[PDB]
Design an enzyme around this catalytic site. Structure first.
Site, PDB file in Angstrom:
ATOM      1  N   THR A 105     101.286  75.705  17.182  1.00  0.00           N
ATOM      2  CA  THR A 105     100.541  74.565  16.576  1.00  0.00           C
ATOM      3  C   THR A 105     100.195  74.912  15.142  1.00  0.00           C
ATOM      4  O   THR A 105      99.806  76.039  14.843  1.00  0.00           O
ATOM      5  CB  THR A 105      99.238  74.260  17.332  1.00  0.00           C
ATOM      6  OG1 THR A 105      99.585  73.680  18.585  1.00  0.00           O
ATOM      7  CG2 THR A 105      98.344  73.241  16.598  1.00  0.00           C
TER       8      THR A 105
ATOM      9  N   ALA B 244      95.302  71.578  24.999  1.00  0.00           N
ATOM     10  CA  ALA B 244      95.443  70.130  24.806  1.00  0.00           C
ATOM     11  C   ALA B 244      94.410  69.353  25.611  1.00  0.00           C
ATOM     12  O   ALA B 244      93.776  68.431  25.096  1.00  0.00           O
ATOM     13  CB  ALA B 244      96.848  69.680  25.182  1.00  0.00           C
TER      14      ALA B 244
END
Ligand SMILES: *[B]([O])([O])[C]([C][C]([C])[C])[N]C(=O)[C]([C]C1=[C][C]=[C][C]=[C]1)[N]C(=O)C1=[C]N=[C][C]=N1
Ligand SMILES: [Mg+2]
Lengths: 231, 244, 250, 240, 235, 222, 233, 211
Positions: free
Chosen positions: H1, H49
């Site tokens: 990420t 997430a």
């Protein structure tokens, strides 16, 4: 008189006045009729409005795919009791993969109402219920009183002027019980029964409320132009 | 049910008074008079024991004057048993403060805490209030010598001189007359005893019917000493001031 | 169920009176006379064993009770209330003192704990006050001999000598004339028996009188030897025979 | 726990316990609040039945809730301490969780909510207290003045009074206070506040307390002499 | 004394009936529902001229699509509004959508009968809950302390309610515009109010699908008042 | 030590069309190297034109589905028989999953249906509630075998138009239900060949405005 | 969390045209010790259901008591307890499955593997499995423990898919089960010769056979086996 | 990420990649790591997430009731603090969050970094995630306060690209946002595959790569 201050007090003749006063709230409520054959069970309810600008208070509540009731009296108390039935029907399905028997649903309502009549601080429920349903032993109609008394019947009516509809059903007993495999004719008999309790006012399109359950018929409520057929 | 027997101790009257607080104050008005006088160099606490007996053991007796810590003391007027409950709570609060901040508790903070407890019994719980009025005599390094009072309502106020219990109306008038701001402890001692001697319901004021205490900086250098007077010492100060 | 009486049953009346406490004091007044006298070298407490029936064995009912080895108690008023207070007093002497400091409490502090229990019954929810006045006699190292009275309100006072119950007013007057600060324990016992005879109607002997003392240490009543510092209980209950012996020299 | 319903409706639709709590406020000493163009002044009555009082240590009538907000009251003194403590705790809790000090409106809304909660909770009686809450919002120069009462209702005021003989001083304020042109300065605002209390107080000696609150946490309490100068000037103009 | 949850011999809860008397003493609030929107209006009723009238908040936002007007013991409404706002936002959290006006009203009414010996007494305030959703369109509900709620085309609550309701009986029709409804609320408020109606002692608001819930400015309402005066003088 | 989790194998696949949606899954249930059942349904009609499959640990998957079906039932009761939209169901499912953040449902969940504009919709979930709308998504044991194939044959990834040589991409032309079912069958037939936990049978649920339809196809039983 | 002490081995079962068959041996093992030889691990519930249990025997006895209490509770205020509102196999299973999953979710499982065999009101065959993890599945044949590895392959040769059920008679199905029990006696080191067998038919009802034995065993070829490779004598 | 955000003259830029990974397997390449809290508030997601999504959506609901109660939009500082206090309750329990709260309030543009460890930091420039280390190089070298909206949007986009190229757990596409005092503005989804080749040609960078 001196023995009506709370639910925990018998009168000298063995009466429970708070329960009797709760019973009185039902008589003030709008009329509702229940009746059944061997294949189907029908609820018919006269809805009441506040005025011409207002809506007509809903009388019938769905509890499960195979069960539901109509109310007369304090509507919030019907919401509490119907919520309880919804949960119990649902507990039976999730745990036992079993549709709750209508007779057992009556026994549960009786016991819930009873606890409120024997303890200090609380109050009795101020509503009467007519429960219909179709289970493994066929069609059923129950009458609930907030005293705790639950009764299985072929037909009945509760609310204001309910005696007229109850007499009609008592005459028609042999006819409407035989109406098997014909939902429209059974509803007709219910609409004709509730008509015996009317004065001044008549059955209009937003006044009448009907519900039915049966062999191959899930519990469904009919309102608005859906009941114009039966007017 | 039980509602039938509930007196409802925490309600207003139509006039906006608290019944039980007013009746508790009525009880306190029959209790022995307690007087507090604050001077520039110390504080005096004087109090009258209620109709005693000759067979009462006075030297080991304590019904009026109690020690909360080394710097703070209280005079009681009302139910002694009720007062001891509160006194023990106040002693604990003073020690809690000392443990937390490593400093002796300021007088007002201790007074506010006790007064808040009293207030609670007038607003919730359904219990009767404490039938007690306190005179707090104390010292700290912020305000110096201080006199406070609290009553069953949980309201508290500061004073130069004050009386609680019986004949407070008469006693307060006498104190208001003879009190001056530049007054000293020895003079305040005399004023307190003279006021009791005139307001007392007894025939004569004697040593066996009194409890007496002083809070003085009359301790060797910058520090404070509490003196709970002994029976013989009360007898001597009565002769000195010219009452007996 | 649940205890729904969470409110006070004792409340201030318009005149400032706490009714239930006054009524409790009235119950104490109806009770049988009991007394206490403090000597220079001891304390004596005494009362009448008012037997409810001659078929009843009055020895099984103890009006004078040991609280600690050096502290004893007697009452006037409601017997059952006294019995439970003695149970609580015995327990609190351990839980709030002996288990902390490893020694028995001094008289004044045990009295303070009993007083607290009685005060709470005067303010707590759903209870009535105790219908008894206690007389607690005791000894401890730093305070010496002492005698305390405890009332239904929870208030307590130290006494040189006093009486409570039925004929307390007359008995207190009798004690005022006889008491002085030079009395020996035997003199106090003699005065106690004289004072108690005035309030008793029927039989007056060792079987109808209950009397105990706080005096010298009794190593014979300790139950073991080997520790010099443990010298035995100062509390002793006088026997039926011991009382009768002193009634001949009366 | 003690659950008894003390605050309940009566046949005529009144909650008597809440209305009797207002009577306790009526008994309390007079309190007045006046907001000027760039300030707010809080005036308070001190009953002179109590002399031999130590004015250094006696609880002051005006309480700081935070550095920028103050609270005065009329009614039961002991009850007011509980509301003030709660308000002070909430003021610090707001700074702690939101990283801004409370607005005057927010603090008032909290205190008013506490008062309301005590009118429909079991086992408790209403607060016998009405409050005047005044101050300035962080980084704002608009004066704020709010009032609360035992029932729990609150509202904003250009000028307001509460307590005993509040009917009289409100009468005075209604004819003397102009909305189009409020007290432009601190002097004019204090003068009007003292004038209003002089209609009720008795003697203008130690019976009047004044507290001026200005923007940016500038709060000060006037002394006896400073107030006495206002009392002198007012009556000298009156002799005409 | 007597139980808080006691039935009368007629079959009514004493406390609920007594709270209804408190609501009759409250300031007037009127709601009118149309196909172009729902209008809400209230009487402010300041107790004194020194009271800054703009601080009187008797019309309140629950969500962007739901508004609310109150009458009676207005302090009791704060916890109801708080619950309503929480219910509306929580449903948006759980279901990523606006909540139905009826469902919101039902959630508020569930609090009503939670009193006994829970809170110690019923609420002493009535609410007019107005809003819009995709299923049932523009809606107006009247929520009582009995736990009952009726839907209305038009409704008045408070001190001048029965006089206002009779007027709403004659004036309402299914083809009303929003502008017509605004003037109609002002007209009826002016009729039942003690003091003379102006922009400072009366407040208007509406809820439309496009703009959502909006409280009207005093300048905007002032123009609608002036427009009302002229049209009444027109015949 | 007691291990409250297990692995029942299985693989599922959701594909969204222009006006339809499919949710496919094999019917094999396993533990370790044994077969429990050759036909144990894994994709369910949950009502309101929504289909669901919770793949992984069967006991947690059965509980989640059971709870969501329950959530749909109570959504009707509480909100006047209102139809639960696919986006609302997805958000509800997140909260079901995250309610056990510290003792998770060990499943990978996929739901499919139609959005409020009538277009096909597929939503994908991780075990603790993170979800997102997708056009194409495989979950479970053989997910890594199938997804690259779908990237290529559904989204035309790495495919360009002949003659241009990498300059112009293959245009994203929509797929019919018949074309999609071909890709589903070829995906599972290929996964069956190389994954031991995939086989026995393939059950596909197709969702349109008309309702929910089923199709079953045999797979290799080795 | 615990460990199983006294244990029961394989439970095996299958569907046939008119009903279901289920079987299990009568042994309660204590590790490698074959301690208890008279343990019944098939427990009938009414006349339409048989619950076969493997794993921990103390937990089995607990489940047995829950089922006995379930029958008692179902009869309460139920005039149709012996008719329309009698306990079904599907009701009994879902109850156990609910209990098993709840117990695993409290990290205190019932250390068992259970097969509920029966016939429903409408005549449909019921056969479903549940274990300590709450994992459930259904198949024409079901077996626990070693049976899963040895019995299922043999029973699946008779009923390989759903369409083979109508073609399978009760004589053929029982023959297959009895053969499977013999194979398990040859090859499972925690099995016994003695076993119980139950048939639930939609026509003939519940037939419960006790004190069955494995017979027609092959051992004679053992005499010819000598040594482990090179040894001749 | 890779996620980043920075304050500048004309507001705050917010950029993020779209890759979700499960070991070496690429689960998704279409992840929205930027969360729409309210039209004036954004939140980034990194790490878990599920955790980031749930708690930031719960934050948006907190921020909304704040607005209804106070008739005022919540500040960036207050919003970031609510999140920080929420996650602090579950500290040590296993939560995995690395977030930025971006918005414009009364104090102008605001940017706070918030993580599951308990850090809450105000700053003009942040980048969080496995690829943050690559992004910082491009940011620190080219960041100015006097940046045009066009140049600022490119910088945030180019910085994600730098990380997406090198970091194996970053890639897919770039999502861009610009936050003004009139609210946030979405500036599209940009495929890294296509974006890389474009930037290579126009900029001349990535010479080591053949194209
Ligand atoms: B990113 O790499 O931090 C990314 C952000 C997330 C919001 C999609 N996280 C992941 O890809 C994580 C694994 C991971 C990789 C590198 C650092 C930290 C964490 N994976 C998931 O969150 C996930 C969710 N559902 C399915 C598969 N993976
Ligand atoms: Mg295979």
């Amino acid at each position: 008189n001196n023995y009506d201050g709370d639910t925990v007090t018998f009168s000298p003749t063995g009466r429970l006045f708070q329960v009797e006063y709760a019973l009185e709230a039902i008589k003030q409520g709008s009329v509702t009729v229940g009746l059944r054959s061997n294949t189907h069970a029908v609820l018919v309810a006269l809805k009441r409005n506040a005025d011409e600008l207002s809506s007509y208070q809903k009388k019938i509540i769905k509890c499960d795919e195979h069960m539901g009731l109509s109310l007369a009296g304090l509507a919030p108390d019907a919401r509490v009791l119907s919520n309880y039935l919804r949960q119990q029907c649902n507990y039976s399905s999730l745990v036992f993969n079993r549709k709750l028997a209508v007779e057992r649903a009556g026994h549960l309502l009786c016991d819930k109402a009873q606890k409120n009549t024997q303890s200090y601080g609380g109050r009795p429920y101020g509503v009467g219920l007519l429960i219909i349903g179709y289970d493994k032993s066929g069609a059923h109609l129950l009458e609930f009183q907030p005293s705790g008394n639950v009764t299985e019947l072929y037909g009945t009516a509760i609310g204001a002027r309910s005696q007229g509809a109850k007499t009609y059903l008592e005459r028609t007993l042999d006819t409407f019980i035989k109406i098997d495999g014909n939902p429209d004719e059974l509803i007709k008999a219910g609409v004709e029964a509730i008509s015996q309790s009317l004065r001044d006012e008549s059955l209009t399109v937003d006044n009448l409320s009907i519900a039915i359950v049966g062999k191959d018929t899930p519990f469904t409520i009919y309102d608005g132009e859906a009941v114009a057929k039966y007017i | 049910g039980s509602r039938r027997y509930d007196s409802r101790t925490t309600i207003f009257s139509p006039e906006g008074r608290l019944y039980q607080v007013e009746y508790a104050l009525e009880s306190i008005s029959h209790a022995g008079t307690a007087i507090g006088i604050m001077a520039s160099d110390g504080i005096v606490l004087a109090a009258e024991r209620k109709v005693t007996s000759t067979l009462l053991e006075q030297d080991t007796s304590t019904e009026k004057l109690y020690k909360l810590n080394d710097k703070i003391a209280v005079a009681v007027a009302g139910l002694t048993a009720d007062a001891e409950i509160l006194i023990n709570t106040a002693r604990i609060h003073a020690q809690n403060y000392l443990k937390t901040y490593n400093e002796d508790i300021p007088v007002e903070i201790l007074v506010r805490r006790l007064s808040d407890i009293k207030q609670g019994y007038t607003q919730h719980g359904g219990l009767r209030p404490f039938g007690v009025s306190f005179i707090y005599a104390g010292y700290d390094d912020r305000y110096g010598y201080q006199l406070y009072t609290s009553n069953p309502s949980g309201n508290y106020t500061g004073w130069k001189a004050i009386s609680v219990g019986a004949n407070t109306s008469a006693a307060q008038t006498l104190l208001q007359m003879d009190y001056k701001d530049d007054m000293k402890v020895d003079d305040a001692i005399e004023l307190a005893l003279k006021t009791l001697s005139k307001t007392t319901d007894s025939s004569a004021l004697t040593y066996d019917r009194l409890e007496f205490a002083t809070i003085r900086k009359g301790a060797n250098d910058g520090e404070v000493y509490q003196k709970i007077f002994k029976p013989q010492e009360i007898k001597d100060i009565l002769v000195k001031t010219g009452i007996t | 169920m649940t205890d729904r009486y969470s409110f006070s049953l004792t409340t201030f009346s318009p005149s400032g009176k706490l009714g239930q406490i006054d009524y409790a004091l009235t119950a104490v007044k109806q009770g049988v006379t009991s007394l206490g006298i403090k000597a220079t070298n001891g304390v004596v407490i005494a009362t009448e064993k008012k037997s409810s029936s001659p078929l009843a064995m009055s020895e099984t009912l103890s009006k004078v009770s040991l609280l600690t080895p050096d502290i004893g108690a007697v009452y006037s008023g409601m017997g059952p209330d006294y019995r439970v207070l003695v149970d609580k007093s015995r327990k609190v002497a351990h839980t709030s003192y002996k288990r902390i400091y490893g020694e028995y409490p001094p008289t004044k502090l045990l009295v303070s704990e009993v007083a607290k229990i009685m005060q709470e019954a005067t303010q707590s929810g759903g209870v009535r006050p105790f219908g008894v006045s206690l007389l607690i006699a005791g000894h401890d190292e730093f305070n010496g001999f002492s005698l305390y009275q405890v009332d239904p309100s929870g208030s307590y006072f130290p006494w040189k000598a006093t009486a409570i119950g039925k004929g307390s007013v007359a008995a207190k007057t009798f004690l005022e004339k006889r008491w002085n600060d030079e009395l020996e324990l035997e003199d106090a016992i003699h005065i106690a028996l004289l004072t108690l005879k005035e309030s008793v109607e029927g039989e007056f002997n060792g079987d109808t009188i209950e009397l105990a003392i706080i005096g010298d240490e009794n190593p014979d009543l300790l139950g073991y030897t080997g520790i010099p510092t443990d010298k035995g209980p100062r509390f002793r209950k006088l026997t039926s025979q011991e009382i009768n012996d002193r009634l001949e020299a009366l | 726990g003690y659950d008894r319903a003390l605050s309940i409706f009566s046949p005529d639709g009144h909650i008597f316990q809440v209305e009797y709590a207002l009577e306790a406020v009526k008994r309390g000493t007079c309190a007045v609040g006046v907001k000027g163009k760039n300030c707010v002044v809080l005036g308070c009555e001190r009953r002179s039945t109590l002399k031999l009082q130590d004015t250094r240590i006696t609880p002051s009538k005006v309480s700081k809730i935070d550095s920028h907000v103050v609270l005065s009251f009329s009614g039961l003194n002991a009850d007011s301490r509980i509301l003030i403590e709660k308000a002070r705790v909430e003021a610090q809790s707001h700074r702690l969780t939101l990283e801004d000090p409370v607005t005057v409106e927010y603090l008032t809304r909290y205190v008013a909510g506490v008062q309301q909660r005590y009118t429909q909770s079991g086992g408790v009686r209403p607060f016998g207290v009405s409050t005047l809450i005044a101050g300035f919002d962080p980084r704002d120069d608009e004066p704020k003045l709010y009032q609360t009462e035992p029932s729990g209702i609150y509202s904003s005021w250009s000028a307001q009074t509460i307590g005993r003989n509040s009917k009289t001083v409100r009468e005075f304020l209604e004819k003397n206070y102009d909305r189009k042109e409020p007290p432009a300065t601190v002097e004019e605002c204090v003068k009007l506040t003292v004038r209003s209390l002089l209609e009720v107080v008795q003697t203008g000696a130690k019976n009047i307390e004044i507290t001026v609150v200005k923007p940016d946490s500038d709060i000060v309490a006037l002394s006896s002499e400073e107030i006495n100068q206002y009392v002198t000037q007012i009556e000298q103009e009156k002799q005409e | 004394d007597r139980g808080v949850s006691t039935f009368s011999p007629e079959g009514r809860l004493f406390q609920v009936e007594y709270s209804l008397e408190a609501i009759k003493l409250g300031s007037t609030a009127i709601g009118i529902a149309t196909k172009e929107g729902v209008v809400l209006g209230v009487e402010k009723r300041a107790t004194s001229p020194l009271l800054e009238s703009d601080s009187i908040e008797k019309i309140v936002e629950i969500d962007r699509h739901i508004g609310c007007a109150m009458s009676g013991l207005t302090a009791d409404a704060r916890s109801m509004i708080e619950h309503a706002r929480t219910a509306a936002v929580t449903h948006n959290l759980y279901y990523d959508e606006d909540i139905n006006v009826e469902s919101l009203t039902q959630s508020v009414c569930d609090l009503a009968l939670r009193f006994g010996e829970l809170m110690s007494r019923p609420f002493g305030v009535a609410l007019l809950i107005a809003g819009h959703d995709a299923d049932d369109g523009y809606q107006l509900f009247h929520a009582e302390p009995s736990g009952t709620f009726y839907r209305y085309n038009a409704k008045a609550i408070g001190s001048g309610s029965e006089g206002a309701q009779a007027e709403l009986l004659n004036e309402w029709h299914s083809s009303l515009t929003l502008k017509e409804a605004e003037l109609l609320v002002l007209k009826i408020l002016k009729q039942v109010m003690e003091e003379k109606l102006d922009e400072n002692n009366a407040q208007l608001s509406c809820i439309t699908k496009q703009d959502g819930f909006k409280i009207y400015d005093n300048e905007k309402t002032a123009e609608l008042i002036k427009e009302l005066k002229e049209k009444e003088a027109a015949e | 030590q007691f291990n409250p989790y297990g692995d029942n194998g299985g693989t599922i696949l959701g594909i969204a069309g222009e006006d339809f949606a499919v949710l496919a899954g094999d019917t094999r249930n396993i533990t370790d190297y044994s077969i429990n059942s050759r036909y144990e349904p894994k994709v369910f009609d949950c009502g309101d034109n929504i289909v669901m499959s919770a793949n992984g640990f069967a006991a947690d998957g059965d509980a989640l589905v059971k709870r969501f079906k329950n959530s749909v039932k109570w959504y009707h009761f509480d909100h006047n028989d209102k139809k639960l939209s696919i986006n609302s169901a997805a958000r509800n499912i997140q909260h079901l999953l995250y309610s056990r953040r510290f003792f998770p449902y060990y499943v990978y969940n996929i739901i499919a249906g139609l959005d409020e504009d009538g277009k096909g919709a597929v939503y994908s979930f991780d075990p603790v509630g993170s979800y997102q709308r997708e056009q194409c998504r495989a979950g479970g044991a053989a997910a890594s075998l199938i997804m690259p194939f779908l990237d290529n044959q559904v989204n035309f990834k790495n495919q360009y138009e002949p003659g241009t040589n990498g300059k112009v991409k293959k245009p994203l032309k929509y797929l019919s239900v018949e074309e999609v079912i071909k890709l589903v069958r070829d995906s599972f037939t290929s996964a069956t060949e190389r994954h031991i936990q995939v086989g026995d049978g393939l059950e596909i649920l197709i969702v349109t405005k008309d309702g929910v339809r089923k199709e079953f196809y045999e797979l290799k039983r080795d | 969390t615990q460990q199983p002490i006294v244990t029961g081995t394989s439970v095996i079962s299958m569907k046939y045209d008119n009903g279901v068959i289920i079987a299990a041996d009568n042994l309660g093992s204590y590790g490698s010790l074959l301690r208890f030889n008279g343990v019944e691990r098939l427990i009938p519930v009414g006349d339409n259901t048989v619950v076969g249990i493997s794993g921990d025997i103390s937990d089995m006895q607990h489940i047995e008591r829950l089922l006995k209490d379930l029958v008692t509770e179902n009869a309460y205020d139920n005039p149709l307890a012996d008719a329309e509102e009698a306990l079904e196999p599907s009701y009994i299973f879902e109850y156990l499955a609910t209990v098993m999953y709840q117990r695993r979710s409290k990290m205190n499982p019932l250390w068992n593997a259970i097969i509920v065999a029966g016939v429903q009101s409408n005549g449909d065959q019921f056969l479903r499995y549940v274990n300590l993890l709450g994992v459930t599945y259904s198949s024409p044949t079901l077996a626990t423990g070693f049976g899963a590895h040895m019995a299922n392959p043999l029973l699946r040769k008779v009923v390989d898919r759903e369409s083979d059920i109508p073609k399978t008679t009760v004589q053929v199905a029982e023959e297959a089960i009895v053969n499977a029990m013999r194979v398990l006696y040859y090859r499972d080191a925690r099995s016994s010769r003695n076993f119980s067998l139950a048939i639930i038919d939609k026509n003939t009802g519940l037939t419960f056979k006790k004190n069955l034995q494995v017979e027609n065993m092959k051992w004679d070829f053992a005499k010819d086996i000598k040594g482990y490779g090179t040894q001749k004598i | 990420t890779t996620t980043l955000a920075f304050k500048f003259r004309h507001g705050v830029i917010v950029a993020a990649d779209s890759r979700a990974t499960a070991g070496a397997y690429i689960a998704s390449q279409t992840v929205k790591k930027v969360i729409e809290i309210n039209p004036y508030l954004l939140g980034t997601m990194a790490g878990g997430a599920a955790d980031c999504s749930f708690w930031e959506r719960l934050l948006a609901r907190q921020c909304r009731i704040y607005e209804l109660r106070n008739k005022e939009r919540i500040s960036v500082a207050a919003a970031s603090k609510l999140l920080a206090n929420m996650v602090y309750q579950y500290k040590g329990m296993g939560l995995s969050m690395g977030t930025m709260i971006c918005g414009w309030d009364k104090r102008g543009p605001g940017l706070y970094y918030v993580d599951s460890e308990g850090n809450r930091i105000s700053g003009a420039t942040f980048s969080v995630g496995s690829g943050s280390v690559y992004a910082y190089g491009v940011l620190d070298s080219n960041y100015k306060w006097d940046l045009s909206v066009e140049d600022a949007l490119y910088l945030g986009k180019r910085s994600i690209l730098a990380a997406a190229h090198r970091d194996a757990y970053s890639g897919g596409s770039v999502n861009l946002y610009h936050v003004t005092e009139d609210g946030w503005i979405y500036h599209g989804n940009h495929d890294v595959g296509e974006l890389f080749w474009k930037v290579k040609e126009e900029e001349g960078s990535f010479n080591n790569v053949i194209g």
